[PDB]
Amino acid sequence: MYGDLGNKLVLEAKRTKQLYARSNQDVNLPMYHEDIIRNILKEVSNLRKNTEYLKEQQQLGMLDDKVAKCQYFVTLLCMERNKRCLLAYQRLRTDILDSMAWNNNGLDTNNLSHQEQEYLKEYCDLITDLKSGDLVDIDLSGSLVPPSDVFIDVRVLKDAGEIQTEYGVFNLIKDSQFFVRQSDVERLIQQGYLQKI
Amino acid sequence: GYYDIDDVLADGTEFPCKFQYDIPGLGYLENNPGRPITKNTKLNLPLWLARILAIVGPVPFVELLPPDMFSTKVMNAIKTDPVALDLHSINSHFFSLAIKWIMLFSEKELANVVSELLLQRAQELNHHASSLSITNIATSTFLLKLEEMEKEIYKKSHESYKDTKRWMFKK
Amino acid sequence: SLPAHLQQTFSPEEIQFIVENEPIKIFPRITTRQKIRHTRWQLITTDDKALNNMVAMRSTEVVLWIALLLKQQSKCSIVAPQWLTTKELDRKIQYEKTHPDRFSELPWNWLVLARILFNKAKDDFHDPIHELRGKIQDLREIRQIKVLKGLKYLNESHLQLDNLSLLEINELRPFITEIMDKLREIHTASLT
Amino acid sequence: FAPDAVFGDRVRRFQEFLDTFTSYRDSVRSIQVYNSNNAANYNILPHRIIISLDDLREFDRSFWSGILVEPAYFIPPAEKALTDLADSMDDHPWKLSFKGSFGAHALSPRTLTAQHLNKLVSVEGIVTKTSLVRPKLIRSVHYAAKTGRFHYRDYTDATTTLTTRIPTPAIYPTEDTEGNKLTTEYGYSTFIDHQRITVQEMPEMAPAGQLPRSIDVILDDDLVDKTKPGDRVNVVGVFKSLGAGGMNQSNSNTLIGFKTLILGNTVYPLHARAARQMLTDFDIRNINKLSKKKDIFDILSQSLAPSIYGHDHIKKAILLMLMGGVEKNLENGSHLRGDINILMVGDPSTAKSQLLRFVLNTASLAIATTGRGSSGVGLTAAVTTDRETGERRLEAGAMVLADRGVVCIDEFDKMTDVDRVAIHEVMEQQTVTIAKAGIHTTLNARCSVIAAANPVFGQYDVNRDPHQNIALPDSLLSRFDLLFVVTDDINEIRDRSISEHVLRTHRYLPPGYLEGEPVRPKLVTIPFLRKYVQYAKERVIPQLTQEAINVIVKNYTDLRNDPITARTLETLIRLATAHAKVRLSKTVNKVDAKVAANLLRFALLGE
Amino acid sequence: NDDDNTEIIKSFKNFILEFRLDSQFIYRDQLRNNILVKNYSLTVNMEHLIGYNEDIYKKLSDEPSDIIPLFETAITQVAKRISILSRASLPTFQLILNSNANQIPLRDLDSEHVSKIVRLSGIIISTSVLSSRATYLSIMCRNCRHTTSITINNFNVSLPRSCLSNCGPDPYIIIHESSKFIDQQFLKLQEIPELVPVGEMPRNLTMTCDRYLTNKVIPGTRVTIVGIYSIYNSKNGVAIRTPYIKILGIQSDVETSSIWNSVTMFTEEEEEEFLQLSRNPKLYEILTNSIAPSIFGNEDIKKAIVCLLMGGSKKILPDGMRLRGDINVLLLGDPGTAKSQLLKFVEKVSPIAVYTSGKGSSAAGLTASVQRDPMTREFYLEGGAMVLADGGVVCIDEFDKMRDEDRVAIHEAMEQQTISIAKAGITTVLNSRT
Ligand SMILES: Nc1ncnc2c1ncn2[C@@H]1O[C@H](COP(=O)(O)OP(=O)(O)NP(=O)(O)O)[C@@H](O)[C@H]1O
Ligand SMILES: Nc1ncnc2c1ncn2[C@@H]1O[C@H](COP(=O)(O)OP(=O)(O)NP(=O)(O)O)[C@@H](O)[C@H]1O
Ligand SMILES: [Mg+2]
Ligand SMILES: [Mg+2]
Ligand SMILES: [Zn+2]
């Protein structure tokens, strides 16, 4: 029956929601269900053909004030349901992509639809437009854990050689350790090169 | 919410419907597009459809028969022992569906019973959410009997307690 | 753009950040008040005057994140607030035991500030710190009993929690608001 | 706090409850007038009421939770109030029973726990080891020969009362206070019937690798003999401890525990997935409506085992075997059996065991057995000592427990022959005879045996005769009504059909479970089918008729005059009579004889 | 005496209320967290008790049968003080002990260990039903109805011999309505197989647990035990008494299906580890490599063994029919092809398994056997290898040498997942999901 593929798709939605919600990291979101979506869209096209057939046959006039009213209303509701299921799935994966944008890309691509890939590009362009405009003195893409300590120990987890910072350098020797201003290394903690606190 | 996935799922559950008219062409609800639906046909329809056909008509096109999940058997089981009851086995979305049913047919008795159920289970749920490790079988059994609605409230509550305990004891 | 767990509550770290904005009394171990016979603090979130005019062991009041930053070094000692002493905590325990319905009027920051100062200023207490930790524990346990008694009376209408701490509130918030919301939704659904 | 001070208030509150929910007053008066009529008219209803425990909750939650959590202090005032109500009706202590919504007090013999002691509990299980019924002395009356007065003595033990009253040593008086000789007056003295049963945990519920637990129930007066062994049951009663538990210093053992019991208040037989299903007039009308559909026998037999492809003639025979023909009793008490006995012998993986398991789930009363797992004694009946008294007593085996039911036997040819020697009397005479241990008795075993077997070789060998293929003696095979031979004979069309059916069968998902989650063309439903079988067994006894006889004799002579024997004829009569039961018809007719002959022709010829 | 008992109780109350590591009062928190979920016990690590005040541990280890009840009493008092408002009821809390003391193997325990705290290990071979023991007897005199009560602690008790002020020769009876009771279970522990001496039969101990330690472990599980090695005076030499262990703590190597069928126990870290393991692309190859890694080749057999360990999905249909989920594999072939070694590995890795050899087996010995309970003089049913393997694997080595009527007995339990017994007046269909 016409609601079923929508239910399969939103059960998929719920499972990917749980997959994302169980962990602190961004779990790489699962494959876009192109096949179920195409089955739904074909089902919607069939329901559209049924409305077309019926609105043709209202010229022929069979009991239309009730019977055609009922057939039309039911198939219309089937289409509303299928729209709701499709938009619920797409809105969840949109929400997760927005989260990933702010977490990393605004500072696994095969699993997205091409609309979702170019959407993620445009949304990263938007985040960068915000932190590049007014309010620029705040790195709007930065962390939301409050700054507890200004100086921190950090252990170098992967090697990256000599890099400059605002008034000096760090030579990121493997398994060396710094005592350093947190604001001068936060980018490297996010990028996974530095370990502690 | 329109995009609230647990609401989209809850709307997908099915309720017993009794049709009030002979209507051609709707037989695909009875798995054959080529035949009518007849008056006093008794059929299970999803709530996203049954909700609408029970109001449009005049007599509406459908009457909704009392579902088993709100039968006198289940209501009596609720009214004896709210915390021991396996609502998940009754229906995984029983609270959302009860809210929808109360709204669809204004029913003070069910509103009171479901409020009593929610409050008395909220006590036990908070006890298991507050208790933390330093999973316990007594907790592990209780979380089976929770709805998806209650599982969400439990995860959020328990995560709050766990986060607070973490902050208090780890430097 | 906001994480799922920060959507409708504060993290315990954010609660600490809020509490860290409170003034606290310190004994300086540096002198910054210049005699008539060099860098100044030049703050913008809080008052600059006290830090610019410190003299060693003349007690003075500064915002707590600065007091902790100084106490990270030997350059300060943080005077415990008057409530955070053995006799005062014992009076609050007796109040809690004496009045089952009310919460005692400990300040809203009490658990957070006790945690902060027991960890970062363990040597500044006049009382032995093990007793202060014990009595803070007594208070949290008794207040938690009262919390459980209170949750038996959740409503579709409202609730009153006179002297509950910021941290205790924040710990309970994603439960109480959810349950009262769902009781409201059940109740309002019944209305014609 | 002392119970007596609150007894009066508890009495009047239960009196107000009974006055409020006046259906209980109507029930009391209905019982009374029934008993008065049947006493005068020259069979008796008991002085017992089942109260919906929900009604007592909705009336007064405090008293309701008193009945649940402190029954020793709340059932005696409730029964006193009920007795006073019965007294208030026009012209003996009345007892209570309970139904509904026990919550955490709904248990099994496993999860019943020492925390539940002295509470009112409901336990689901299967009955085993029912004791003998014995009169238990509760009051004795004595005529003092010289004094003229009738003295009396009450008695007590831990089973007679919900509270631990002081014990009374079961001694009869013999002398007055003045020393005058007493004489005991039976008939004025009072005895209750007493029975002790073991309720065992349902094996389907027992967790991985643990055997079923069991507990002992006490039943008094009218509850006695409400169950036999093998009955699946729900018992409601007060879970109690009794005895010294080794605290009496003659017992040196430190570690033994206290004995525990349920003192029973009501006993409900079960087949929920009730042993006898209730039928509404809607059910009656639907059952009759379906019986007039011209091909109803095909509909019902196709509705048997819908997850088994094919095997149409076997499912037809199974349906007629669930609805066996009428048993005849003749001069000198001579007897002709009415069961239909089926043997499925054939290749492996031909659904023989699955069909037995469907029958086990569909008949009103079915007992499962397997060839190796069954002893001949374990099949008929076994002598044991009843530890309640110390006497040698028979324990019913599978054939006796299935009386007025069916027996399923899987792996039947794997039996040892001293087991099969014990099958013969059940098949031939519907009875078993015991002549051992000083016990010399005969027991009823009136049941349809349906059995599954393989040939002596792993698969049926069409090069060789049935007596050479089939292990069993002809002296046993001739006792079965229908001997079916099945084969897994390879064929691409049938293999395609059965395969796609089996894949549809394995793609099932029960309601509410998520995808891949583990578990905790018209056809009737199995509950409907069970109701139809019960209706037809109870309410129609088809009478044989000459127009059917003509078909029967024509077909019997034709089958015989081309394995056939004299017993084949009454098998045809049984099959026709059962098909008349399928039609719900008071007469057997030519259609029934035609179907019976067609089906037996399939069984004999492989038609 | 009760002055010293009061001081012991106060010392333990202080241990609960004062013991602290890294800013957390672990025993106050554990006691509260246990009270909320309504398990009235406390798990104490004796390292912490030693570290707090070694005099207390000296008192406890000198005479645990007198000191454990006082510790339990202390726990009750703290439980009330931290969960019930003082001046606006709970049972006696069980004390559970965790320990890392040196183990005594089961065969070495003897007269020097009587009444000492003992740590050991073994395999549980049997678990009895939950008998009921009194914690508190309400008592009265049969004649004058003098009423009193006896509190009982289960460490080695009786009724009084005569009335506490004529009442006759043996005057007291129990009042069961106001008496209180607890669950008591008997376990039989057999010593570890690789610790049995040369040519010895494996020795076993009867042992008891109560309150929350009941139903915690099941037959076949390998466990470590903390308990008071102790004595009881059996009804049966001269001046000879039966040894047993009063269990104070159980720690299985892993917990599985002890009293749970739909319930589970997994930590977040191991669940996440299993989740990311499930997502691995080379998972089947890694699992195949894990099977019998010292056995060369036989790759399709290892693949099949993975499938047998995992099993399919069991199903129950509206027909009422049941569809078999578990999988059966036969290794038939030449000598020294590592078949027995593969069966040994499968019995080693499976969470539930039994290994038997066909010539060592019996029909009853495999499915289930009828037994007669001697002092009851009454028949009962005891489980064979199929019952003990229920929920797992049975490794039937040496299968072709199994006698044919023993071999035939496997058929039903192997396909229908059930054992249909009909013997000695017993009739049941036991489950065997193997
Ligand atoms: N016609 C059928 N339709 C569906 N499943 C079938 C059919 N025939 C056999 N099977 C399947 O075959 C399996 C074995 O069935 P079972 O009843 O044990 O066979 P059997 O005749 O008893 N063989 P055996 O015990 O070795 O003599 C079951 O899982 C059935 O579902
Ligand atoms: N592929 C192999 N890799 C390693 N060791 C092997 C291999 N095959 C055999 N062995 C060794 O040879 C012995 C195999 O014995 P076993 O496991 O009993 O084989 P089997 O197949 O059971 N033969 P049998 O019991 O006579 O039927 C062990 O000592 C193994 O270590
Ligand atoms: Mg079979
Ligand atoms: Mg070998
Ligand atoms: Zn006395």
CSV table of C-alpha atoms in Angstrom, one decimal, chain D residues 139-243:
chain,number,residue,atom,x,y,z
D,139,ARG,CA,-14.6,-29.4,63.5
D,140,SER,CA,-15.7,-32.5,65.5
D,141,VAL,CA,-18.8,-32.9,67.6
D,142,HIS,CA,-19.3,-35.2,70.5
D,143,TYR,CA,-22.4,-36.4,72.4
D,144,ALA,CA,-21.5,-36.7,76.1
D,145,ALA,CA,-23.6,-39.8,76.9
D,146,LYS,CA,-24.5,-38.9,80.5
D,147,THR,CA,-24.3,-35.1,80.4
D,148,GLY,CA,-26.5,-34.9,77.3
D,149,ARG,CA,-24.7,-31.9,75.9
D,150,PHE,CA,-23.0,-31.9,72.5
D,151,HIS,CA,-19.4,-30.8,73.0
D,152,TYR,CA,-17.3,-29.8,70.0
D,153,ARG,CA,-13.7,-28.9,69.0
D,154,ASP,CA,-12.4,-26.7,66.3
D,155,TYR,CA,-9.1,-27.6,64.5
D,156,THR,CA,-6.4,-25.6,62.8
D,157,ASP,CA,-3.2,-26.0,60.7
D,158,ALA,CA,-1.1,-23.7,58.5
D,159,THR,CA,-3.2,-24.6,55.4
D,160,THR,CA,-6.7,-24.1,56.8
D,161,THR,CA,-6.1,-20.4,57.7
D,162,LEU,CA,-4.5,-17.4,56.1
D,163,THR,CA,-2.9,-16.4,59.5
D,164,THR,CA,-0.8,-18.6,61.8
D,165,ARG,CA,-3.3,-19.6,64.4
D,166,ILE,CA,-2.1,-22.0,67.2
D,167,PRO,CA,-2.1,-25.6,65.9
D,168,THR,CA,-4.5,-28.3,67.1
D,169,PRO,CA,-3.2,-31.9,67.3
D,170,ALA,CA,-5.9,-33.7,65.3
D,171,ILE,CA,-6.9,-35.6,68.5
D,172,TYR,CA,-10.5,-36.6,69.0
D,173,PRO,CA,-12.0,-35.9,72.5
D,174,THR,CA,-12.9,-38.9,74.6
D,175,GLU,CA,-13.9,-37.5,78.0
D,176,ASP,CA,-15.9,-34.6,79.5
D,177,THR,CA,-14.3,-32.3,82.1
D,178,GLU,CA,-16.1,-34.4,84.7
D,179,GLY,CA,-14.7,-37.5,83.1
D,180,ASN,CA,-17.9,-38.6,81.3
D,181,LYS,CA,-17.2,-40.8,78.2
D,182,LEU,CA,-17.8,-38.9,74.9
D,183,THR,CA,-18.9,-40.4,71.6
D,184,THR,CA,-17.9,-38.8,68.3
D,185,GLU,CA,-20.8,-37.6,66.1
D,186,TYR,CA,-20.0,-37.9,62.4
D,187,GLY,CA,-22.5,-36.2,60.2
D,188,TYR,CA,-22.5,-33.2,62.6
D,189,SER,CA,-18.7,-33.1,62.5
D,190,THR,CA,-17.3,-31.0,59.6
D,191,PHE,CA,-14.6,-31.9,57.1
D,192,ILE,CA,-13.3,-30.0,54.0
D,193,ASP,CA,-11.9,-31.7,51.0
D,194,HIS,CA,-8.2,-31.1,50.6
D,195,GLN,CA,-5.9,-31.5,47.6
D,196,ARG,CA,-2.2,-30.6,46.9
D,197,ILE,CA,-1.0,-30.0,43.4
D,198,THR,CA,2.4,-29.1,41.8
D,199,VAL,CA,2.2,-26.2,39.3
D,200,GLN,CA,5.3,-26.4,37.0
D,201,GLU,CA,6.8,-23.5,35.0
D,202,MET,CA,5.8,-23.5,31.4
D,203,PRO,CA,8.8,-25.0,29.4
D,204,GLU,CA,8.5,-22.3,26.7
D,205,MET,CA,9.3,-19.6,29.4
D,206,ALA,CA,12.2,-21.2,31.2
D,207,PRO,CA,15.5,-19.4,30.3
D,208,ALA,CA,18.4,-20.9,28.4
D,209,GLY,CA,19.6,-24.2,29.8
D,210,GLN,CA,17.6,-24.1,33.0
D,211,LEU,CA,14.9,-26.7,33.8
D,212,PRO,CA,11.4,-25.7,34.8
D,213,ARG,CA,10.8,-24.7,38.4
D,214,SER,CA,7.7,-25.8,40.3
D,215,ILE,CA,5.7,-24.9,43.4
D,216,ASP,CA,2.9,-26.6,45.4
D,217,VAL,CA,-0.7,-25.3,45.6
D,218,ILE,CA,-3.3,-26.2,48.2
D,219,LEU,CA,-6.9,-26.4,47.1
D,220,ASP,CA,-9.9,-26.7,49.4
D,221,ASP,CA,-13.6,-27.7,49.1
D,222,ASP,CA,-15.0,-26.8,45.6
D,223,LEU,CA,-11.6,-26.0,44.1
D,224,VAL,CA,-10.7,-29.7,44.5
D,225,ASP,CA,-10.4,-31.7,41.2
D,226,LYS,CA,-10.8,-28.5,39.1
D,227,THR,CA,-7.6,-29.6,37.3
D,228,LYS,CA,-5.9,-32.9,36.3
D,229,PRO,CA,-2.2,-33.3,35.5
D,230,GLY,CA,-1.1,-31.8,32.2
D,231,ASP,CA,-3.6,-29.0,32.5
D,232,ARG,CA,-2.2,-25.6,31.7
D,233,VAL,CA,-3.5,-23.3,34.5
D,234,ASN,CA,-3.5,-20.0,36.2
D,235,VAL,CA,-3.8,-20.2,40.0
D,236,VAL,CA,-4.5,-17.3,42.3
D,237,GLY,CA,-3.8,-17.6,46.0
D,238,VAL,CA,-1.7,-16.5,49.0
D,239,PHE,CA,1.9,-17.5,48.8
D,240,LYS,CA,2.9,-18.7,52.3
D,241,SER,CA,5.6,-20.4,54.4
D,242,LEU,CA,4.9,-23.1,57.0
D,243,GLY,CA,6.7,-25.4,59.4
